[model samples]
Target: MITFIGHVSKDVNVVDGKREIAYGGGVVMGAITSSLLGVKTKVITKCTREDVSKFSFLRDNGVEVVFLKSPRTTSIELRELFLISAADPFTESDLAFIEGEAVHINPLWYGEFPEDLIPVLRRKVMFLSADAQGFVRVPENEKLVYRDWEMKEKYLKYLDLFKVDSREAETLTGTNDLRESCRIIRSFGAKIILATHASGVIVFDGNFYEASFRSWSLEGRTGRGDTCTAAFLVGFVFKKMSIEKATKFAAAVTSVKMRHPGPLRREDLEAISGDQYF
Candidate 1:
């Protein structure tokens, strides 16, 4: 089973009048997409009863969720947020896996993971992909303050695939060029690194690689990378597609999601003939 680890929470989107009144965590979205695409999936997520929504989406879609209930609610925030915003935000503890085949780990938020979980994952995961946000955080008021943190050698070797934003690239690699930045990340022991920019994805395995999707300007939206990470791992690890095909489906699936009103579904890909893998 493909086990995804993260929390779940409620989200309010006023601009679109759509609140993910109850939605899965960032990594939870990945599990949702991956499970529906025909992979046997499970989620190892921690949340309090209040903040976390029912795992109806995952369960209904046949994804088994291994819930780790905490003293706090699932972490939450007002997404697609702009300007100054404040309200009651949700919070939860980090992840600890009991068992699974592959593990996809995203941030519980930009918090320091206890060293113990790291070793457990290193020993357990065969195909491991880590979203690079949790490594960098400016902590204050017991919450994350956005800022760049270097992706140190101490942690990179433990990860198989690493995903980062352009800003993270600049801070971690010290190079403005995406290719150069990815190279630096690779040198740190990440077998594969995919860096997202305003333009597209820059990937590096043994050699430098790059891919771009048709910019759907009309449907520009948030959480695209979260979806992209979810799609890439599911396509590559679960479907076992070639890198080229996997990346293509990743972009296509995310594009379809961006254009749609809310979360994605299998029927959503029916319009694009060959893109039905998800």
Candidate 2:
């Protein structure tokens, strides 16, 4: 089983100047993608009692939901790739719901998780991975401040997978060059480094492997990177594909999901399996 942890976001998509509400949060997107690929998936999130019902659809899709009641669910307005609101941060104290072979920490905004939980989570799970966005992007006055994770060195060794987008990679490595960023991150002891850019993704796990999205339509680009990481985990772990194949698998899955809005479908994976990541 694979576990995903993060806020259950109330997403507001700004389309043609109209507000279209949807449910998200990296964990929601990640969990659905992983489970649809035939992996046993469980999601651990924080939400108010009222908002807890909003996540029932996950159960409908064969994913388990375990949440800690909070004062509010994480809320965000996604516009032109910018986050308009901050996610409510959760801590290790709220993670009593975790149970799986792999635990993926995919916080929506920065403080949705605290860095101190990194070592603790690694100790509890067989595999520990994290989306570095939560570590580097600090919330400020409803905005975000980007910088390197202050205690990265202390916890990098515990991460089985360290996922990052171009911007997050830049913030962590102080360079936009993907190879340099991966090398720097790998030097810190992360077993696998999955760094994604606009067109494709790069994986560094004792070697370098890469693949392109080859997406024809990019309508649902909001969760593309996080989806890539989640899909990659499914590819490498549950699917048992090689590192190179897993990278391609994730790119292929992410490429297809970008054509529409919402979580991936099983048919989508079957149809896109033989297709190139391109």
Candidate 3:
């Protein structure tokens, strides 16, 4: 099983001048997508006792959730974020018993997982992967901004796979070119680098693979990278799909999800035709 670690955020979105509340965070969205694809998935996160119930849909979907029951949960406005509260960081005692074929670290921002956490997890899990935004998307002035990860060279080598978006890639590598940024990240010791953008994903693992989303609309674009990351790992590690095929599958899942709002459903993949996404 692949395990996800992060917080379940309380998101406030202003869509057409309306306030909408949603229970989602990187880890929550990623695990749901993985499980929905028929892969066994588990999530480790923090939220209040009252907030635990909000994850029932995740439970219903068969994604095991282990909560730390923090008093304050992550609250993001999505736009400015407001970024009001932060959950506790993962502790060594908390993860001593953790076991998985892979561990996907899904931090809402930096500090959710300490820099030291990388080496610890590297020894425990067969494969260690993470979303790079957690390290670079720093919270400044009650909003999120990009910055370089100072400990990247020290911590990145422990990661088997690393995921980054256009901005995160640019921020981390100081290169806007996705291919060059992927190569730069590869030089840092990440065996595989999945760099994504609004259109789709570019994957580099010694060789390069590319896939584009065919979403006609961008209504459900909030968690595109999270969903794509999980789908790619599920297809690559669990289903034993080729890198090229996995890239396409991940893009397809996010493509269908982008046409709607909220987390992707399994039927979304079952419904889309080959050309529509592949």
Candidate 4:
């Protein structure tokens, strides 16, 4: 089983003359991708009673849902643009649903959600993956600030696979070079480092593979990177493919996701075959 730990986002996407609320989060996207790919999956998410119903579909889909009672209401927001997908941030607590063969911690809420629950989660299993986005959302001048992760040394040792984008790369290494950033992350104790640049993606797990599949058809790109991480992990953990093949598959999945809007449906994956990541 693959366990996805993060906040359950109630999102309203407005673009290209369309609007709707769908399940949203890094772990949510990754888990849905895995479950649709035929893996038994589970989610440990924080949501209020109102947002609780948003997850009913997950139960219907056979994805186990652990509804952690939240002190505050669950989060919801609207997306007006694709380049900078912004929404009102909400405070949330963390919950580690359970132990699984593979786990990905991709919290969307700014608070120390899943990371705070890591020690409890680590007691169950060690094969873990994490997206670094949630850690750096600090407050500045009464506005939200997305800071570069300087405290990576504190958590990198606990992760096997670490995913970050170009901005994060620049922040971590104090250099604009993505390759240098990947190397720096690898030095911090991660075996696999996938650094995503605006141009393409660079994967290094003792070796390097650079691949790009840019799409202009999509109206928004809120969860694209998270989708890539989930897809890559599925290929590596379940399909047991080499890093190169896995990276391409991950790329293909993410490309398909972008071509549409939110999480790509199972039928959306049928057209994808070998070289699917191209």
Misplaced by over 4 Å in model 4 are: 12-22, 74-97, 114-116, 139-142, 214-216, 274-278
Error of 3 at 220 (Å): 1.3
Kindly provide the TM-score of model 2 when superposed on the true structure, using C-alpha atoms.
0.92
Q: Write the per-residue lDDT of candidate 2 for residues 98-150, one digit (tens) a residue.
A: 68789999886666788888888887888899998778876666655677887
Cα lDDT tens digits for candidate 4, 1-278: 88887777666566667767676767667777777777788887766666687667676556787777665443444422121232323232233236568888776534535344555555566578888767655434424456766557867777778888876667667878888888888998888998776646789987899878666355546677887888888888878888998898777777777777666567756755644432
> By summed lDDT, which 10 consecutive residues of candidate 1 come out lowest?
81-90
The C-alpha RMSD in Å for every predicted model, in order, reads: 4.3, 2.6, 2.1, 4.3
Sequence-dependent TM-score of model 1: 0.80
lDDT of the candidates, in the order given: 0.62, 0.82, 0.85, 0.69
Better of 1 and 2 by lDDT: 2
Between candidates 2 and 3, the TM-score winner: 3
User: TM-score ranking from best to worst?
Assistant: 3, 2, 4, 1
Highest-TM-score candidate:
3
Q: Pairs clashing in candidate 4? A: 252-277
Question: Taking the tens digit of each residue's C-alpha lDDT, what string does model 3 give over 160-253?
Answer: 8999998889998888998999999999988899887968889899899999988846468888889999989988988888999989888888
Residue 248 displacement (Å), model 2:
1.0
Candidate 1 Cα lDDT to native? 0.62
**Candidate 1 off by > 4 Å:** 12-22, 74-97, 147-151, 215-220, 272-278
State the lDDT at 75 in candidate 3.
81
